[PDB]
Amino acid sequence: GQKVHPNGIRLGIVKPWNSTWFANTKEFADNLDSDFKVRQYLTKELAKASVSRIVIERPAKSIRVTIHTARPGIVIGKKGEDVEKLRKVVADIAGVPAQINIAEVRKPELDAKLVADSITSQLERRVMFRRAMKRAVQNAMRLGAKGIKVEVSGRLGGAEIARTEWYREGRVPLHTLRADIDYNTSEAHTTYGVIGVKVWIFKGEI
């Protein structure tokens, strides 16, 4: 087990943080756990909506949750009853007056959360993994994407030993720190157990 998380080593360099509140030591743990609850809830209740990121920020006793998603229409719905329902329950969880926004992730096959969730969904619909991976690499390289690597792992095809079998195309410069590597990871709970899907997407060199 030996590679650094390629989001974490780029946190001040190119990648931003998904939480951008300041807090002193008295409420740092409380704000942090409140963020675990709103991302847990808001991740479970938008499983069909293809959600990429949820960014929390707290401007002066009020949360401001931004849902980067690929299907904004299914998040908002017929006149946005679903949004006001979500800020009602996020205001229930965080205990502050909640705002909520939706940012449309166009080009959803270049986002690693959406790619890993895609391949994970296909693996738990019992399709063969080489199609899922290989289709994901092809259609991601089709639109921009100066590199992509996907990597499934663990008891693939229902075996009794676990393999990995990664694929990559293009250039994925993972030790370069100015590389805009969009990396994310999902787990596929199949009837044989968990299958881990990692995906790195190299977008640009700065």
């Binding site: 951008t20 509140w21 300041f22 807090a23 002193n24 920020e57 707290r58 401007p59 002066a60 401001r64």
Partner: protein, 98 residues
């Protein structure tokens, strides 16, 4: 007289915010000293990186809190009216204590 002490985790974000509060204040009121920087607090955390034995593999982390101090001298009513409700900062803690 009116010290506004700003704290944030991102130095670009805090010097943007304090540049805005400086030009706001000395644009409306008068006699702003300047964004004095006041040492960054580096809090370091050294966690074990493995879920079992393996002490020697550890990951070191830090949170850098940046301060800035402004210290606006003239107590104009225009600068305290115009100084309130105008921040547009998200990760800044201000202290506007007189």
């Amino acid at each position: 007289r009116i010290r506004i002490r700003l704290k944030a985790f991102d130095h670009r974000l805090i010097d943007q915010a304090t540049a805005e509060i400086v030009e706001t204040a000395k644009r409306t009121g008068a006699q702003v000293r300047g964004p004095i920087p006041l040492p960054t607090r580096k809090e370091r955390f050294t966690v074990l990186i493995s879920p079992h034995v393996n002490k020697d593999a550890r990951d070191q982390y830090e949170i850098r809190t940046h301060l800035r101090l402004v210290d606006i001298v003239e107590p104009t009513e225009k600068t305290v009216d115009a100084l309130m409700r105008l921040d547009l900062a998200a990760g800044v803690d201000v202290q506007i204590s007189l």
